[PDB]
Write an enzyme that holds these catalytic residues in place. Structure first.
Site, PDB file in Angstrom:
ATOM      1  N   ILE A  80       0.776  -1.137   0.016  1.00 55.65           N
ATOM      2  CA  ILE A  80      -0.222   0.017  -0.050  1.00 55.65           C
ATOM      3  C   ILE A  80       0.766   1.476   0.051  1.00 55.65           C
ATOM      4  CG2 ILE A  80      -2.131  -1.058   0.811  1.00 55.65           C
ATOM      5  CD1 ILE A  80      -1.646  -0.092   3.588  1.00 55.65           C
ATOM      6  N   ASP A 133       6.470  15.674  11.082  1.00 59.20           N
ATOM      7  CA  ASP A 133       5.955  15.425   9.758  1.00 59.20           C
ATOM      8  C   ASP A 133       4.472  15.504   9.434  1.00 59.20           C
ATOM      9  OD1 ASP A 133       6.771  15.486   6.932  1.00 59.20           O
ATOM     10  OD2 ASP A 133       6.880  12.812   7.113  1.00 59.20           O
ATOM     11  N   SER A 159      11.372   5.850   1.408  1.00 57.20           N
ATOM     12  CA  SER A 159      12.578   6.187   1.673  1.00 57.20           C
ATOM     13  C   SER A 159      12.901   5.203   3.259  1.00 57.20           C
ATOM     14  CB  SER A 159      13.135   7.468   2.155  1.00 57.20           C
ATOM     15  OG  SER A 159      12.175   8.255   3.116  1.00 57.20           O
TER      16      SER A 159
HETATM   17  C1  LIG Z   1      -1.893   4.225  -4.460  1.00 55.36           C
HETATM   18  N1  LIG Z   1      -2.812   3.675  -3.825  1.00 55.36           N
HETATM   19  C2  LIG Z   1      -3.998   3.345  -4.519  1.00 55.36           C
HETATM   20  C3  LIG Z   1      -2.352   2.527  -2.816  1.00 55.36           C
HETATM   21  C4  LIG Z   1      -2.387   2.989  -1.220  1.00 55.36           C
HETATM   22  N2  LIG Z   1      -3.894   3.854  -1.185  1.00 55.36           N
HETATM   23  S1  LIG Z   1      -3.725   5.004  -0.242  1.00 55.36           S
HETATM   24  O1  LIG Z   1      -2.529   6.076  -0.691  1.00 55.36           O
HETATM   25  O2  LIG Z   1      -5.076   5.670  -0.248  1.00 55.36           O
HETATM   26  C5  LIG Z   1      -3.277   4.648   1.448  1.00 55.36           C
HETATM   27  C6  LIG Z   1      -1.714   4.576   2.009  1.00 55.36           C
HETATM   28  C7  LIG Z   1      -1.589   4.290   3.004  1.00 55.36           C
HETATM   29  C8  LIG Z   1      -2.549   3.918   3.975  1.00 55.36           C
HETATM   30  C9  LIG Z   1      -2.312   3.321   5.461  1.00 55.36           C
HETATM   31  C10 LIG Z   1      -3.319   2.859   6.246  1.00 55.36           C
HETATM   32  N3  LIG Z   1      -3.007   2.343   7.507  1.00 55.36           N
HETATM   33  C11 LIG Z   1      -1.917   2.830   8.091  1.00 55.36           C
HETATM   34  N4  LIG Z   1      -1.523   2.307   9.187  1.00 55.36           N
HETATM   35  C12 LIG Z   1      -0.805   3.372   7.077  1.00 55.36           C
HETATM   36  C13 LIG Z   1       0.572   3.823   7.641  1.00 55.36           C
HETATM   37  O3  LIG Z   1       1.084   3.598   8.550  1.00 55.36           O
HETATM   38  N5  LIG Z   1       1.340   4.481   6.767  1.00 55.36           N
HETATM   39  C14 LIG Z   1       2.662   5.053   6.608  1.00 55.36           C
HETATM   40  C15 LIG Z   1       2.969   5.642   5.626  1.00 55.36           C
HETATM   41  C16 LIG Z   1       4.423   6.060   5.859  1.00 55.36           C
HETATM   42  C17 LIG Z   1       5.143   5.727   6.992  1.00 55.36           C
HETATM   43  N6  LIG Z   1       4.682   5.183   7.759  1.00 55.36           N
HETATM   44  C18 LIG Z   1       3.431   4.639   7.998  1.00 55.36           C
HETATM   45  N7  LIG Z   1      -1.062   3.815   5.937  1.00 55.36           N
HETATM   46  C19 LIG Z   1      -3.981   4.006   3.580  1.00 55.36           C
HETATM   47  C20 LIG Z   1      -4.297   4.554   2.364  1.00 55.36           C
END
Ligand SMILES: CN(C)CCNS(=O)(=O)c1ccc(-c2cnc(N)c(C(=O)Nc3cccnc3)n2)cc1
Ligand SMILES: CN(C)CCNS(=O)(=O)c1ccc(-c2cnc(N)c(C(=O)Nc3cccnc3)n2)cc1
Lengths: 350, 350
Positions: free
Chosen positions: B28, B147, B32
């Site tokens: 998902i 951030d 980096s």
């Molecule tokens: C490109 N698309 C279609 C795939 C990803 N979908 S999104 O960009 O809408 C998206 C991305 C991440 C999360 C998500 C969900 N639960 C989480 N817990 C995290 C998370 O912890 N993300 C994160 C990102 C960067 C660094 N550390 C953590 N991210 C939800 C939707």
């Protein structure tokens, strides 16, 4: 069409204003600085750019003072300057009448990138060489551009002439005088700038130029990232973790803070398989942690990667001769006069 | 499908390892930092996120240590953590099993922006309030996220629950201890960060949150710029030129450097005509040059802009009840316990 007549001062030489008439005024750019127009000189029919910025009379415009000193084939020339009204009342605008160059390295690189192709190496050589000449020249006056990026590199598609533009961040760097660390655009910032150094030198432009070279070779930026941390991770992935002395040479008061221990990625593995070995060797010598270890612009001009430009048989892909490449002056060569033996080939300028 | 079984430590409480089985592993996120996966827990069918980063052999992971301390409804919870072999041979990877939240403020805002619409103010109120609660909570432990940006703000479209994510830059800020100035993403950086201050406080997150509020109201970032100089020009255009004391409060080494003299743009003139006056007043109090003059997160929660959220009749547009908003703890109220008189409305007491 509408004809605008102004009394404007020639950019170089004696302060003897003359009447300048121009037509076909179109906006070609907008930004934090102000507006950039394209116009046609009524006299010659020659196209010019007019950079219009709000001027405060409390101090002299730094960009104008730097432009008045410069005369180089790889730098957009200040032809005239004048004052006018624009969008207020008591507010005066400074207008810089500059050489107009129709394309940018940014737009050219993006065409190739979108078409899934890379720019032929002959253009990478021509563009980078001309950029290094423009940098050797401004640095010879102690002037650092501070905003080297593909958008500030103008190109003529037919002649392959490159002209450096946008002197809005340019500054004469004096040893012991502190300078703002927040200049320079994301992706092109030297690691000293990311670390917040205020004691940096003209070698920040050399790092930026190395980022442009690597990007033209890769088809995308070499050190992307929306934060300094992400940018540094990308730098560390290629260069390897900086040593405590390398950190000391960048920003002294940042040695205590730690980074992830990454072994140096071999530079040949960074680029596609058919990348000229000389192009890679140039990158490695521009993209150094230690600012003093980076090649100077004049030394970069003399690098083996540019040997094809020195060939008497070299031609542009459109059949034309290459543009002016060897008309070096004493000023331009001042950092290392012996380099002229490499720089001006035997067939050149007789 | 493929079932992965691991023995993981629960994120909070006693080290009593649990056998965790998950399936339908998809990428998902990439960055980096490493990789973020989505997975489905075999028994409950409940979706989780797995943040996989490289384990540094030298020290304990800072993000893991911060996550282990946190338990808040507006923060992505660390459910479990475990170690694995990963992609690269003979190295250890830390795996953080987190709450999965399907949307981001970034994606939602971009959908409205592309459709030439603005997000309804009820969602701006709900999202911003929940962000300020998450910030009041982490700041109560001395922890600064560093951030804050729309991509790190997760949303559940049906419940309107917002969860702060990405603790990769988070740090406990101790007075007199210097901190890196290169954290925080472009557009959301406090002016002290742009000026390279290392003595900054948790109020950098409040500036970032103000940038998110202004952006949700405008339909685009309030302070764009590819360089610090351009960002500062955009800040000066709205806030007016900072005074020498304001500069001293942000970064004292920058008192001497001069900026263009611009009068403060009235905040009502920056937003569209029908923008709630309370939304504008909130921006002006978050987006202050002086870090100590900015509202604290808890004070921002108590602002008049959030009065509709305190109405006993408030509902989401989809007919559902609003998510949890008043379940304040002693920990989250610690900065200013008397604020509870505004924060927990009469109906919530009953
Ligand atoms: C490109 N698309 C279609 C795939 C990803 N979908 S999104 O960009 O809408 C998206 C991305 C991440 C999360 C998500 C969900 N639960 C989480 N817990 C995290 C998370 O912890 N993300 C994160 C990102 C960067 C660094 N550390 C953590 N991210 C939800 C939707
Ligand atoms: C296709 N449209 C959008 C108009 C052409 N745009 S462009 O990006 O191809 C472009 C933009 C500017 C210039 C140009 C030409 N001569 C110049 N001399 C300048 C110039 O001085 N630019 C500049 C930019 C920012 C600050 N100061 C100066 N720009 C040429 C092409």
């Amino acid at each position: 069409s509408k004809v605008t007549t102004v009394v404007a001062t020639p950019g170089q030489g004696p302060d003897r204003p003359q009447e300048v008439s121009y037509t076909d005024t179109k906006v070609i750019g907008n930004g934090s600085f102000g507006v950039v127009y394209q116009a046609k000189l009524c006299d010659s029919g020659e196209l010019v750019a007019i950079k219009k910025v709000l001027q405060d009379k409390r101090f002299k415009n730094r960009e104008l003072q730097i432009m008045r000193k410069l005369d180089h084939c790889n730098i957009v020339r200040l032809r005239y300057f004048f004052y006018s009204s624009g969008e207020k009342k008591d507010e005066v605008y400074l207008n810089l009448v500059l050489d107009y160059v129709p394309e940018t390295v940014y737009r050219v690189a993006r065409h190739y990138s979108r078409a899934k192709q890379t720019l032929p190496v002959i253009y990478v050589k021509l563009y980078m060489y001309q950029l290094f000449r423009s940098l050797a020249y401004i640095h010879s006056f102690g002037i650092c551009h501070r905003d080297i990026k593909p958008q500030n590199l103008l190109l003529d598609p037919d002649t392959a002439v490159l002209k450096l533009c946008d002197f809005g961040s340019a500054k004469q760097l004096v040893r012991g005088e502190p300078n703002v660390s927040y200049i320079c655009s994301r992706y092109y910032r030297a690691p000293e700038l990311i670390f917040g150094a205020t004691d940096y030198t003209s070698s920040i432009d050399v790092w930026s130029a190395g980022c442009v070279l690597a990007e033209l070779l890769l088809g995308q930026p070499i050190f992307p990232g929306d934060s300094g941390v992400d940018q540094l991770v990308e730098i560390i992935k290629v260069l390897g973790t900086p040593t405590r002395e390398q950190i000391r040479e960048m920003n002294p008061n940042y040695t205590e803070f730690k980074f992830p221990q990454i072994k140096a990625h071999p530079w040949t593995k960074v680029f596609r398989p058919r990348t000229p070995p000389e192009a890679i060797a140039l990158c490695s010598r521009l993209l150094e942690y230690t600012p003093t270890a980076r090649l100077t612009p004049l030394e970069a001009c003399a690098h083996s990667f540019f040997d094809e430009l020195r060939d008497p048989n070299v031609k542009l892909p459109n059949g034309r001769d290459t543009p002016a490449l060897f008309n070096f002056t004493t000023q331009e060569l001042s950092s290392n006069p012996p380099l002229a033996t490499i720089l001006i080939p035997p067939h050149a300028r007789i």
